[PDB]
Amino acid sequence: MITETQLTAIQTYALQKLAHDHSGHGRDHLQRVNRLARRLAKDEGANLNLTLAAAWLHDVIDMANPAKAHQDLIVQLNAQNVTADDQTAIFAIIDHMSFSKSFNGPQKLSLEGQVVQDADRLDAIGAIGIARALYYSGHVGEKIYDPAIAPREHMTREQYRHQPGTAINHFYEKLFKLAALMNTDTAKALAAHRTAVMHEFVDQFKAEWTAD
Amino acid sequence: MITETQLTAIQTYALQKLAHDHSGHGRDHLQRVNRLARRLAKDEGANLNLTLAAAWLHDVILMANPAKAHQDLIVQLNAQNVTADDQTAIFAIIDHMSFSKSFNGPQKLSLEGQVVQDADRLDAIGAIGIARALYYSGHVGEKIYDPAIAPREHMTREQYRHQPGTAINHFYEKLFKLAALMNTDTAKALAAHRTAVMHEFVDQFKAEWTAD
């Protein structure tokens, strides 16, 4: 199983890879998902170090050339007395959690995996979720909204990942669902108060838009 | 004054120069402000064509090279035989209605100016303001929040435009004051159902950040 001084090795690796990010997944996001991952691990008594490990890393991926990403991570993983069993587990979590995959059938997950998916999704919803949502869109010149394009119902991972929608529609395509798919239990009660604000913003948004 | 033909031309000019905006100042923004300027102008009995004209042209001049931009809009107004006095009345507004300016001391405005300003700000608050606000931070790479950094209080022309702040600080530093600064009676009213949302956002954002 992973070790404390290896985790920090992973932490160090994850942060640098994400300095100068400017997309909504920088230190603050990493540390917050990390800080949530931590408390969470306990509420379920899951393997911390493996949990926090995947937590810092899930994102370092997602990236212009996804392949380049993995490799380098495997490399770094290696030069750190990483065990191949501690590695696979990592990619098991980090490679079967992100929403996009749910469009390929709900792939059951590890406990500590479920603890990550939760902590990661918790920081994508709420007021902070709203901010990251649009900040990211503005970092991509993505159409914020268009009363002419409805939110896509049944998508495909390819569409979701390649086809462009509207920042507003993102709430309806994924941001509004993460609270009812939250794995933990403590996460759930935390997802509740974090869903009411997103709606206060979307309805408010469309009301205002329609008024104008 | 400004003729219906020149007006349309200016509209055409504006929308072209703001294509590929990706900062929250593209065609929707322009249209929302426009449509707002028109209602407000009428309620106040303001000269319509000067108003929209100045409304259409405020953002055009976000600009890497402002000089270049100014020296472009004239080429256009000139190509449209807009009269001297009319050209003067257009810069009179645009160039002396921004909040950034107000720092250099209180500057009196026209009625058409107060209307353009109220229209422009009216679209920088409410859910839409929230969206556009952070959507801009994504675009520029600005920081979303930093408990260490607190909202400036005695800003100056430069500080505000040169020295970048945090996204949240912008509500405190600017957006939260607009509705009190609104000029039009019709606007003060409208600016009244557009503050509660921004406040719920900055509040829920700091509640969620600390919680973690």
Side-chain angles (χ1 to χ4, degrees), chain A residues 2 29 38 45 51 73 94 102-103 119 126-127 136 141 143-144 163 166 169 181 186-187 195 210:
Chain A
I2 301 178
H29 162 68
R38 284 174 149 295
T51 304
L73 178 63
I94 299 184
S102 63
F103 295 92
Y136 180 77
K143 194 181 299 174
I144 296 185
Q163 184 180 55
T166 76
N169 284 1
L181 280 165
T186 302
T195 272
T210 293

Side-chain angles (χ1 to χ4, degrees), chain A residues 184-200:
Chain A
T184 314
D185 243 39
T186 302
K188 289 176 164 181
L190 204 52
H193 187 23
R194 294 205 192 185
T195 272
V197 193
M198 314 204 105
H199 281 112
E200 262 131 49

Side-chain angles (χ1 to χ4, degrees), chain A residues 127-128 193 197, chain B residues 199-209:
Chain A
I128 286 172
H193 187 23
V197 193
Chain B
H199 271 96
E200 271 151 60
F201 177 68
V202 185
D203 287 0
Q204 268 310 99
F205 179 100
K206 308 224 280 187
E208 285 172 41
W209 175 292

Side-chain angles (χ1 to χ4, degrees), chain A residues 127 131 135 138 194 208 212, chain B residues 35 127 134 139 142 194 208 212:
Chain A
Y135 180 104
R194 294 205 192 185
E208 271 161 47
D212 298 338
Chain B
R35 140 182 53 185
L134 279 86
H139 173 61
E142 214 180 71
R194 299 190 164 185
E208 285 172 41
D212 302 342

